[PDB]
Short mmCIF file of C-alpha atoms and ligand atoms in Angstrom, two decimals:
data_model
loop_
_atom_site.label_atom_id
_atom_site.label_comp_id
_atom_site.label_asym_id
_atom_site.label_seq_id
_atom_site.Cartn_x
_atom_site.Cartn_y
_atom_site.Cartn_z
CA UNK A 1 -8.98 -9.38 -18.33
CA UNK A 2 -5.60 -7.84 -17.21
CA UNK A 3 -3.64 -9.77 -15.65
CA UNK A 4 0.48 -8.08 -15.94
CA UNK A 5 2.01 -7.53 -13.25
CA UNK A 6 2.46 -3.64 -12.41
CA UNK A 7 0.44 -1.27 -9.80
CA UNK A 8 -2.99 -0.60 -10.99
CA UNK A 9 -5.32 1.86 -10.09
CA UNK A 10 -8.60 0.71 -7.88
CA UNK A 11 -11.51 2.38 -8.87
CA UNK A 12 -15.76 3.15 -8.34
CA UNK A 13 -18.55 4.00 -10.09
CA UNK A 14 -21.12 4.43 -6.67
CA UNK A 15 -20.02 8.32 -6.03
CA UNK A 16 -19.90 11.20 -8.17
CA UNK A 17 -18.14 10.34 -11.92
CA UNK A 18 -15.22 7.68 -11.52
CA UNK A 19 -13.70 8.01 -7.38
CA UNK A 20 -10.55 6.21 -7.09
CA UNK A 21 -10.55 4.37 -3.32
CA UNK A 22 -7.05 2.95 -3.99
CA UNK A 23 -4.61 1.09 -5.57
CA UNK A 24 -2.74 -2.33 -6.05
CA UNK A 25 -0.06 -4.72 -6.97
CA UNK A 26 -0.22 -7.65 -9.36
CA UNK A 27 2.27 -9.84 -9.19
CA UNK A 28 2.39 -13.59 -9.84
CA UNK A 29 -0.93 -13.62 -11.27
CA UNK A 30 -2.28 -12.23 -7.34
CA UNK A 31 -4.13 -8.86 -6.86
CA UNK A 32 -2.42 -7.05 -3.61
CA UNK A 33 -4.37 -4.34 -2.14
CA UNK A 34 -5.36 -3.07 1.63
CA UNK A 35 -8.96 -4.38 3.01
CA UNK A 36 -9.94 -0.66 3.64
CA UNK A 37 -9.74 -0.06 -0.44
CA UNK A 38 -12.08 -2.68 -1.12
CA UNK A 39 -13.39 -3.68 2.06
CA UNK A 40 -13.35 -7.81 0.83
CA UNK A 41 -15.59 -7.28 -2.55
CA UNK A 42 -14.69 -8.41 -5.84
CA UNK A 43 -13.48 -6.40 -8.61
CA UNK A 44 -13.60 -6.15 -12.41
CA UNK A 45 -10.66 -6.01 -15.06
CA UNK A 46 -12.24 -5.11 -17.93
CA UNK A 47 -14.40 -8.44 -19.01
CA UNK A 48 -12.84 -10.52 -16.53
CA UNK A 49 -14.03 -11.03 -12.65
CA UNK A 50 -11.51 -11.06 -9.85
CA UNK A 51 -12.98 -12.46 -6.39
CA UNK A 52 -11.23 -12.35 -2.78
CA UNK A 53 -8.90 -15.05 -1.86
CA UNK A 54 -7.34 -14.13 1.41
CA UNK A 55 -8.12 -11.22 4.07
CA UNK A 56 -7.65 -9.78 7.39
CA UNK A 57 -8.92 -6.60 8.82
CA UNK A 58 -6.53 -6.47 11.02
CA UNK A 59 -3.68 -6.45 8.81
CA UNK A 60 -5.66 -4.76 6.44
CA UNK A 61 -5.15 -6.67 3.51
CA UNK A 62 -6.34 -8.47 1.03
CA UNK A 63 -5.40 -10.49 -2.13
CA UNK A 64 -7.58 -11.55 -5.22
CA UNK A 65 -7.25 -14.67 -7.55
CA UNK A 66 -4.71 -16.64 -5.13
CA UNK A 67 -2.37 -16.01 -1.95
CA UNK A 68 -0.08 -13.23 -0.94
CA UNK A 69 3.16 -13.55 -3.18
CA UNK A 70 4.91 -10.25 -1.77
CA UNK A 71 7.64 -11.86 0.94
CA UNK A 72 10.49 -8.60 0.90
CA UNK A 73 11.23 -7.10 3.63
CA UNK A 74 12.70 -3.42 4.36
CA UNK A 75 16.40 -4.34 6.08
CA UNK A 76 15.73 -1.61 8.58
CA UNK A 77 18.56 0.19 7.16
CA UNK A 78 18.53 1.38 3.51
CA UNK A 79 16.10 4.07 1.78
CA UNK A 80 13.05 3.14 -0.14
CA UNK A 81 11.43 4.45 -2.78
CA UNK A 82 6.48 4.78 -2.50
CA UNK A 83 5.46 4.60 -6.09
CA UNK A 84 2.60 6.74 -5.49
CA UNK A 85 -0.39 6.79 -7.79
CA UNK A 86 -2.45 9.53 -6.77
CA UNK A 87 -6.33 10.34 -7.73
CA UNK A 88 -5.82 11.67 -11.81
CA UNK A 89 -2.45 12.21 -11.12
CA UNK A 90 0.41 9.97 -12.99
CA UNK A 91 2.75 7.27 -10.89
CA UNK A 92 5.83 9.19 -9.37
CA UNK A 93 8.62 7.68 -7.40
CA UNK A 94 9.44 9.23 -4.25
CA UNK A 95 12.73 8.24 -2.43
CA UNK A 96 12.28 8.33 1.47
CA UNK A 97 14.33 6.85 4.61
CA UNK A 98 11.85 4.91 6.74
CA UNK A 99 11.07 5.74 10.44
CA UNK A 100 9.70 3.28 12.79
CA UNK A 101 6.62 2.43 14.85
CA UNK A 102 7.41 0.59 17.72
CA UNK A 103 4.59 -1.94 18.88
CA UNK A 104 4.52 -4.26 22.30
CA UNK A 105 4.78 -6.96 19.34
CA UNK A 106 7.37 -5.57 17.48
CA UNK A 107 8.84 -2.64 15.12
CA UNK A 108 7.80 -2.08 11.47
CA UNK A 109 9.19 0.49 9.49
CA UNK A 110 7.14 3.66 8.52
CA UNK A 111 7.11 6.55 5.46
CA UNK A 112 6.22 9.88 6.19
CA UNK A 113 5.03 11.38 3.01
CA UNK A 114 1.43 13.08 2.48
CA UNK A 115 -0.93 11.79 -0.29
CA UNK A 116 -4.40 11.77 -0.57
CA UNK A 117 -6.71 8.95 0.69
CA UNK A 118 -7.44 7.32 -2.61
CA UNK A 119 -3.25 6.39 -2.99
CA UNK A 120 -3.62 3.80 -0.37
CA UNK A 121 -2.25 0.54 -1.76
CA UNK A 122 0.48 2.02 -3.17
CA UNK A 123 3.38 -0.28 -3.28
CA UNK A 124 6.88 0.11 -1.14
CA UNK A 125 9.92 -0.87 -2.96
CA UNK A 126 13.60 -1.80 -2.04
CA UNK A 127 16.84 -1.32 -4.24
CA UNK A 128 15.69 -4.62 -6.44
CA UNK A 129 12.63 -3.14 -7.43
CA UNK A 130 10.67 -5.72 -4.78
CA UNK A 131 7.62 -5.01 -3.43
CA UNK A 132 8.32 -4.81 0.59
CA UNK A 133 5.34 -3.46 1.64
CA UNK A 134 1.70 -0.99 1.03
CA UNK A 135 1.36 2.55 1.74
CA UNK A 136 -2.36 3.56 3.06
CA UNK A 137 -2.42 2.50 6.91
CA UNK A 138 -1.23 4.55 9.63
CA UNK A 139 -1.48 7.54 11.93
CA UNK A 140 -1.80 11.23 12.27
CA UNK A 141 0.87 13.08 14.02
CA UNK A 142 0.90 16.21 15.97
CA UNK A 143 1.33 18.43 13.02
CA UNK A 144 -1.54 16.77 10.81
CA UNK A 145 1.18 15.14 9.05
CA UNK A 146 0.37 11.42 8.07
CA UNK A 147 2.63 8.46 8.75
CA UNK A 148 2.24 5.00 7.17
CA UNK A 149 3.13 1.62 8.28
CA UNK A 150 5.02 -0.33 5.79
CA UNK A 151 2.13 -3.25 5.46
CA UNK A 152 3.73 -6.07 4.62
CA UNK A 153 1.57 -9.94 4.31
CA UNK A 154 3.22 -13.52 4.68
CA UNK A 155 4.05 -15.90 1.87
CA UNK A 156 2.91 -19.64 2.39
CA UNK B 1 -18.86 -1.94 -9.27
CA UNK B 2 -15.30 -1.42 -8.20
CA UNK B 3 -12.55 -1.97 -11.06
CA UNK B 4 -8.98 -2.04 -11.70
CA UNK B 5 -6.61 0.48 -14.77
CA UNK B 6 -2.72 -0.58 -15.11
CA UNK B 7 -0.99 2.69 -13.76
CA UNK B 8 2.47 1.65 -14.31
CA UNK B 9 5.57 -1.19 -14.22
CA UNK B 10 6.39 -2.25 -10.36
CA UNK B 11 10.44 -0.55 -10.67
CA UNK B 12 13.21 1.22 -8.88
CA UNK B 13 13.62 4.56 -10.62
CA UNK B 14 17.28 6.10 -10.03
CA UNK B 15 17.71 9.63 -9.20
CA UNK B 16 13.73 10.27 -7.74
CA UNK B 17 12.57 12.95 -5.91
CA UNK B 18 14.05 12.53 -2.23
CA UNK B 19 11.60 13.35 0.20
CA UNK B 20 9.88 12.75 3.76
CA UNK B 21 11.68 12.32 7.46
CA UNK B 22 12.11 9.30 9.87
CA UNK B 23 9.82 9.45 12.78
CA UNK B 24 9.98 7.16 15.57
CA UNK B 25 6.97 6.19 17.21
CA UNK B 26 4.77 4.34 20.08
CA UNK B 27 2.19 3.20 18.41
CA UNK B 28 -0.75 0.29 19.30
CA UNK B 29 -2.67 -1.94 17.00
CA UNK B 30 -6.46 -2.45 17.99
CA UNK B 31 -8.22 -4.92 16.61
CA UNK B 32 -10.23 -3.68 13.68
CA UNK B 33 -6.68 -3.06 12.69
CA UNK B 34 -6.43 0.83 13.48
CA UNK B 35 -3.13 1.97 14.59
CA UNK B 36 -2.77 4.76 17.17
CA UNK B 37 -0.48 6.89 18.88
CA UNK B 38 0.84 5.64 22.29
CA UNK B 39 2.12 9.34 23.12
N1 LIG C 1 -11.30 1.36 10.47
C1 LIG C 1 -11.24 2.79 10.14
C2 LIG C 1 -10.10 3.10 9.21
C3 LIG C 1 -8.81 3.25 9.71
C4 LIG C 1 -7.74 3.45 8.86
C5 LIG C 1 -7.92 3.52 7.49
C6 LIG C 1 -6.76 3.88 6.59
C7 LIG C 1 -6.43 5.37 6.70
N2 LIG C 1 -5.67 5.86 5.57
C8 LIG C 1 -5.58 7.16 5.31
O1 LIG C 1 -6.29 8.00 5.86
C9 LIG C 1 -4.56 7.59 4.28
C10 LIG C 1 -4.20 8.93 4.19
C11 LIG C 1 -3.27 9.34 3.25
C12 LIG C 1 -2.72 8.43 2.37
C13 LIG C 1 -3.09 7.10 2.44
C14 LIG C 1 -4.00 6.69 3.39
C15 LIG C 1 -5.71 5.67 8.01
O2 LIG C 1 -4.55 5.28 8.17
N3 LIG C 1 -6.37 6.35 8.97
C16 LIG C 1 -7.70 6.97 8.84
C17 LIG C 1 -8.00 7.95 9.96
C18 LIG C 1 -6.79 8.82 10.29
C19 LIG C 1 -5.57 7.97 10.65
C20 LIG C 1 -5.76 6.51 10.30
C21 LIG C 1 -9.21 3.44 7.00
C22 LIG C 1 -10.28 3.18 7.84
#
């Protein structure tokens, strides 16, 4: 079916009307999207059937028709911009300056911005327009606030 | 059952809306990959 790249919506027919769960990133021909979203199943692009070719729940993600092709990083440094897509709402750019969450394995960076649920997916770009990470998996903070990691995959 | 819709082209837009703060925090990753706050 459709196969340019861009961020696409991730949709369901199960609940009441169409429910969107999440979104994604094609990019080299590769569906990008967190495992929560789709929780491993395959998906449908019009006609055309896209099945699971990598996963792990405990990076939570997962990418359809080959492997993970997103390898930018955030430089720890610089602002980024979430292209949200939010439930029946159009994609909107949102310029933020990442914090951090600091792990006994290491830091990642983190974006404090407030979407609903279904935006999870959504991608994380740097200065070049490269994806360097999805929006969707984090924490709650004192103030009911959310903060997501920036969940980035490795390229073979 | 579940599908994909194009929402858009994967770009930097100059001059967005400037939003959100820079939090640091302790956090731990478990292993059904659920992060949580380490105070
Ligand atoms: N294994 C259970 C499980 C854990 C984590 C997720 C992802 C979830 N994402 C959002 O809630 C979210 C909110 C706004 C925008 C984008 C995503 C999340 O990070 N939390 C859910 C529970 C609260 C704090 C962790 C789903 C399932």
């Amino acid at each position: 079916g459709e196969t340019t790249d861009g961020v696409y919506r991730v949709m369901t027919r199960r609940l009441l009307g169409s429910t969107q769960v999440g979104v994604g990133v094609m990019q080299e021909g590769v569906f990008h999207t967190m495992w929560h979203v789709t929780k491993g199943a395959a998906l449908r692009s019009g006609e055309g059937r896209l099945d699971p070719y990598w996963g792990d729940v405990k990076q939570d993600l997962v990418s359809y028709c080959g492997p993970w092709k997103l390898d930018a990083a955030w430089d720890g440094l610089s602002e980024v911009q979430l292209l949200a897509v939010p439930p029946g709402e159009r994609a909107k750019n949102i310029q933020t300056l990442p914090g951090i969450f600091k792990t006994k394995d290491g830091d990642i960076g983190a974006v404090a911005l407030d979407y609903p649920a279904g935006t999870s997916g959504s991608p994380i770009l740097d200065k070049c327009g490269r994806v360097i990470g999805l929006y969707g998996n984090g924490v709650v903070i004192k103030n009911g606030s959310y903060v997501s990691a920036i969940t980035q995959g490795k390229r073979e | 059952d579940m599908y994909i819709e194009r929402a858009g082209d994967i770009t930097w837009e100059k001059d967005a809306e400037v939003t959100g703060n820079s939090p640091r925090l302790d956090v731990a990753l478990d292993e059904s990959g659920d992060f949580s706050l380490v105070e």
